[PDB]
DNA sequence: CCGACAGCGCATCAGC
DNA sequence: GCTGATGCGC
DNA sequence: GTCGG
């Protein structure tokens, strides 16, 4: 809002760098500048003012000066005039179409959704599904729908085997009023880091959710990670619910609560607890928390039976998920 | 001046 | 066939 | 593109 013009500009530049230039570090640099500016509680008056913020450097400061002086950016104006770059950038909005497939499509004269529809035989399965649900995938999920999805997923999982444990993580678990997708973590007492005790633990769950027509499509599935599409059941001549993105991860239970911590997030809170965690000489990844030795050497992973256990190790107060914004 | 900027599972392709 | 690289989205 | 070593 306050510097929306600037941050829109930076976001536009980030998408260009990612999708057209294929320069993911520049993408992230621009994102990082836009994010720090978005949190700044003043109307930016000059580039030099902005350069004081971490993540804003000499070149963005110059771009901000030009934008403040003229109401636009020549670089971006020129990018908007480039139909080919605009098409490449647009196509990467299809899930499964990255910067490289987008460029390849456009070089073959495939430039719009309509072109994709008439060239399906050139899309892989992921891309076909991304195309099929192009609009739905960009829509957000209201919390009320998430609650319903949680209730379906948690109970259907237990019907396959009462000993399964599933947890809906991500922004939902942080109490967010809307979510972009559904992140499910799954475990079972038979699955531990050392051994596979049961076959097809993830496959049977996915099968069950297909059976009750909650899961409608699959982007990818292996022995530990499922990515696909789901949809709430529609009551009588009610409008259809949008198709939603769902991810299910099968985690060994001896690593389960480290996973839950990681995939609960947020983004900026994980680093805070990590960078911190080095305090007391502990290192934290998504699977484990290990002690750091006097020489810098990570020890064996400590036992974790709950999320609180992780907190008891680096000795901080258990933080409720709602409080993990940063 | 320089390389880091996360690293992984899965699908697909490259190169034998 | 095989193995390793790359593209992609987390 | 920006940062830190
Ligand atoms: O590449 C990743 C993947 C996951 N994570 C973490 C933190 C995060 O909050 C969580 C879920 O990843 P999402 O992409 O689903 N973001 P989130 O669920 O928090 O918000 P959204 O409603 O937009 O999905 O796991 C990362 O930090 N980086
Ligand atoms: Cl880059
Ligand atoms: Cl502009
Ligand atoms: Cl580990
Ligand atoms: Mn999520
Ligand atoms: Mn997600
Ligand atoms: Mn081949
Ligand atoms: Mn510097
Ligand atoms: Na700065
Ligand atoms: Na895409």
CB-based contact A258:A287 (threshold 8 Å): yes
A283 is in an annotated binding site: no
Residue partners of A79: CB distance under 8 A and separation at least 6: A12, A16, A20, A85, A86
Span from the CA of A171 to the centroid of ligand 1 (angstroms)? 7
Ligand nearest to the CA of A287: 4
Calculate ∠ Cα A282-A286-A287, nearest 5°.
Answer: 80
A83-139 CATH, one of 2.60.40.1120, 3.30.70.1400, 1.10.150.20, 3.50.50.60 = 1.10.150.20
The span from the first CA to the last CA of chain A, in angstroms, equals 21
Under a CB-based contact definition with an 8 Å cutoff, are residues A264 and A257 in contact? no
Among candidate residues A26, A32, A39, A63, the one labeled active-site is A63
Which bases on strand C have an atom closer than 7 Å to a protein beta carbon?
6-10
Between CA A26 and CA A32 the distance in angstroms is 10
Pocket-testing residue among A24, A150, A171, ligand 1, by greatest number of atoms within 8 A of Cβ: A171
Query: Looking at the domain A1-82, which fold is it?
Result: DNA polymerase; domain 1 (1.10.150)
Q: Is A201 among the annotated ligand-binding positions?
A: no
**Dist. CA A86 → ligand 2 center (Å):** 19
Nearest to A43, CA basis, from A5, A73, A84, A88:
A5
Q: Do domains A83-139 and A140-262 have the same CATH topology?
A: no
Say whether A63 is catalytic: yes
Q: Strands of A182-187's sheet, edge to edge?
A: A165-168, A182-187, A244-250, A225-230, A215-221
Q: Please check if A174 is assigned to a binding site.
A: yes
A220 neighbors A128 (Cβ within 8 angstroms): no
A28 backbone φψ class: left, alpha, beta (φ>0; ψ -120 to 50)? alpha
- Whether cis (ω within 30° of 0) applies to the bond prior to A315 is no
Longest dimension (CA), chain A: 67
Distance CA A283, CA A17 (A): 33
- Sorted by where each begins, the domain ranges of chain A are 1-82, 83-139, 140-262, 263-326
CA dist., res. A11 & res. A15, Å (int): 6
| CATH of region A140-262, choose from 3.40.50.300, 3.40.50.150, 3.30.460.10, 3.40.1010.10 | 3.30.460.10
CA of A159 and C1' of C9: distance in angstroms?
30
**Contact, A22 vs A13, CB < 8 A?**
no
Ligand nearest to the CA of A178: 1
**What architecture is the A263-326 domain classified under in CATH?**
2-Layer Sandwich (3.30)
Cα–Cα dist A76/A176, whole Å:
34
Give the span between the Cα atoms of A59 and A47, in whole angstroms: 9
- Phi, psi (deg, nearest 5) at residue A63: -65, -40
Strand A289-291 to A282-284 pairing: antiparallel
């Amino acid at each position: 809002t306050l510097n929306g013009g600037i941050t829109d500009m930076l976001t536009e530049l980030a998408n260009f760098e990612k999708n057209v230039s294929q320069a993911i570090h520049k993408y992230n640099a621009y994102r990082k500048a836009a994010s720090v500016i978005a949190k700044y509680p003043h109307k930016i008056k000059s580039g030099a003012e902005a350069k004081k913020l971490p993540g804003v450097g000499t070149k963005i400061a110059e771009k901000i000066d030009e934008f403040l002086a003229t109401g636009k950016l020549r670089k971006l104006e020129k990018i908007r005039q480039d139909d080919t770059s605009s098409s490449i950038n647009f196509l990467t909005r299809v899930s499964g179409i990255g910067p490289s497939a987008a460029r390849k499509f456009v070089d073959e004269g495939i430039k719009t959704l309509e072109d994709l529809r008439k060239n399906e035989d050139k899309l892989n399965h992921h891309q076909r599904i991304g195309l099929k649900y192009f609009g739905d995938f960009e829509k957000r999920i209201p919390r009320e729908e998430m609650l319903q999805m949680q209730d379906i997923v948690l109970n259907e999982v237990k019907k396959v085997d009462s000993e399964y444990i599933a947890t809906v993580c991500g922004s939902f678990r942080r109490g967010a009023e809307s979510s972009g997708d559904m992140d499910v973590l799954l475990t079972h007492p038979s699955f531990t880091s050392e051994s596979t005790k049961q076959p097809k633990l993830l496959h049977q769950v996915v099968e069950q959710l297909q059976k009750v027509h909650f899961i409608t499509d699959t982007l990818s599935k292996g022995e530990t990670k499922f990515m696909g599409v789901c949809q709430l059941p529609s009551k009588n001549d009610e409008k259809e619910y949008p198709h939603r993105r769902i991810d299910i991860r099968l985690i060994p239970k001896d690593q389960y609560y480290c996973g839950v911590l990681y995939f609960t997030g947020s983004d900026i809170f994980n680093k805070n607890m990590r960078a911190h965690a080095l305090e007391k000489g502990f290192t934290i990844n998504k699977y484990t928390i290990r002690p750091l030795g006097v020489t810098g050497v990570a020890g064996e992973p400590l036992p974790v039976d709950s999320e609180k256990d992780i907190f008891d190790y680096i000795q901080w107060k258990y933080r409720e998920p709602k409080d993990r914004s940063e």
